[PDB]
């Protein structure tokens, strides 16, 4: 039976690096790595370097597409130093590593030959502010599609992709667990924009950011491993993030192991798991590349859309 | 505010014909034209000839895309006489003319320079048989997404697009209003496949045929004009299709004008209108080209996705 997809193991995937140079130190890697992530330079070589090659092939080809349409329209012909921005989505559960995957990809792409402006935007910035989530009764549904300003998000990406000189995104504080009054992240005609968040691959009765992606990544694992990663990170954060007395979640710092395991499982149960099953996981079939992790965080399997 | 879309009037659209030759006679047109359609050679020149140009530009460019991915994969390099089939979806309400739009497009494309094999498949073939729709209680929901074998449909298109030597579709009788035992439409590595039906542009929790389209058309009009077209065609068919004594709908042939208007409005009300509002119309935002008709069937407006 034919298939839109081709499966790979790590063996088969890493043979597709060919000549791609590794342009990243073990220290540089460390500063991109998230708490509890296991990615090392081997993973970068065997997994991210083929990915970066695939993308660089598709960038140039994807630009022929937009050029056909401008030829058709009888249009100027595009300043070769403002091409149509290549837009990359990165999706997956809370805790699955997707933020690391995206920072790593940005660093690999920024170090490609001619130094492309490669911007990274997470959807956190487009969450409704808490006072607005309260109004909507959504303070316990952060991460659910409806907790985001999806219209503002779509505007932002439509602005960038349509060639705008600048586009602004709001900024979320993880310390305060709320949007920061007055803060802007300003994206300036980048060559590549990576957009990272839980539900970025969603589709619906309107045109959405997924409809603008030229390439998409989904970072996957079994649900039970993700929960284990999530709980263990919650426990770890008792002495990193929760320890700051300003942290919205400071009360958690003084939880016993067992108490924190109880809190963490409840949050997973009531918020993150439902979101993953109801909203995120149904977007996986469309991702261009699914990156499949084993219980140790290791990417050992891959699924590429060839159609 | 920037926009994925550009709007056109007929003036602006038809200037984009450039050199495209008209390769179709007034008689050839007639045999493609559906009952109550008003399309003539002018419409073909000013509307379909630019469309055919747009497509021919995108075909060659879309093939660079699939070629990038085979380069990446270290793959043979594609027999230039079996390229990856370009897949075109055509959608819209019952009665809106979409079947004519598709037959016309096929004829225009087949007459392009090097004589591309251009196949046309409607989703009718993939309706569940009546005995199966009865089983599911769906005999009065023909046209609703669930009245189709969507898995078989997706298989068919995945087969063709992935380069298969042949792929078979079942065949629906409009005379008998049921699938024909033993009938097959056989599609053989065409260069272009047009797929036409009500809901072909749908998205969902699985990969669907819309995810395989390289280009999509939606044929649009105000809902009240479509109803008027539908009712008037139902009345007309009293002496064409319904007149055949074998026709499943023969009892309608003997309806008075007023009685047929009553029957037709009820079918619109209970089946076609709900389907259009709930299922078809929410797919319009994704179509590459929306063809907007006035109350006389005339295409006077267009909306192209540039993103
Ligand atoms: N259990 C929890 N409760 C509150 N805040 C949490 C949390 N777990 C993580 N956070 C915070 O929110 C963000 C979590 O990102 P998330 O887990 O959704 O994606 P991810 O898995 O890609 C992060 P990374 O790849 O860097 O490990 C981090 O910035 C962290 O500070
Ligand atoms: N009111 C009705 N009741 C039963 N059968 C009908 C019908 N109206 C049309 N049909 C039949 O079913 C098909 C209708 O196609 P539909 O209206 O869904 O698309 P369309 O508007 O693109 C057709 P065309 O473009 O040729 O006018 C035709 O083959 C016709 O024989």
From Swiss-Prot, chains A, B:
Its EC number is 2.7.1.33. The keyword Cytoplasm applies. Its main location: cytoplasm. It comes from the Bacteria. It catalyses: (R)-pantothenate + ATP = (R)-4'-phosphopantothenate + ADP + H(+). ATP binds at residues 92-99. GO terms for molecular function: ATP binding; pantothenate kinase activity. Belongs to the prokaryotic pantothenate kinase family. PANTHER family: URIDINE KINASE. This is Pantothenate kinase.
């Amino acid at each position: 039976e034919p298939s839109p997809y081709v499966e790979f193991d790590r063996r088969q995937w890493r043979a597709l690096r060919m000549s791609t140079p590794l342009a990243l130190t073990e220290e540089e890697l460390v500063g991109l790595r998230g708490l509890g992530e296991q990615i090392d330079l081997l993973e970068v070589e065997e997994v991210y370097l083929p990915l970066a090659r695939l993308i660089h092939l598709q960038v140039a080809a994807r630009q022929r597409l937009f050029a056909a349409t401008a030829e058709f329209l009888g249009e100027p012909q595009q300043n070769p130093d403002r091409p149509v921005p290549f837009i990359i989505g990165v999706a997956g559960s809370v805790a699955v590593g997707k933020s690391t995957t995206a920072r790593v990809l940005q660093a690999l792409l920024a170090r490609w030959d001619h130094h492309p402006r490669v911007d990274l935007v997470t959807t956190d910035g487009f969450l409704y502010p808490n006072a607005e989530l309260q109004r909507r009764n959504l303070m316990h549904r952060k991460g659910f599609p409806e907790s985001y300003n999806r219209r503002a998000l779509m505007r932002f990406v439509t602005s960038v992709k349509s060639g705008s000189d600048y586009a602004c995104a709001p900024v979320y504080s993880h310390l305060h667990y709320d949007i920061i009054p007055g803060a802007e992240q300003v994206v300036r005609h980048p060559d590549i924009l990576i957009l990272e968040g839980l539900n970025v691959l969603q589709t619906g009765p309107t045109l959405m950011v997924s409809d603008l992606f030229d390439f998409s990544l989904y970072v996957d694992a079994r649900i039970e491993d993700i929960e284990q990663w999530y709980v263990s990170r919650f426990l770890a954060m008792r002495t990193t993030a929760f320890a700051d007395p300003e942290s919205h979640f400071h009360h958690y710092a003084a939880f016993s192991d067992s108490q924190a395991v109880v809190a963490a499982r409840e949050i997973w149960r009531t918020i993150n798991r439902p979101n993953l099953v109801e909203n995120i996981l149904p977007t996986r079939p469309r991702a261009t590349l699914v990156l499949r992790k084993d219980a140790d965080h290791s990417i050992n399997r891959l699924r590429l859309r060839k159609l």
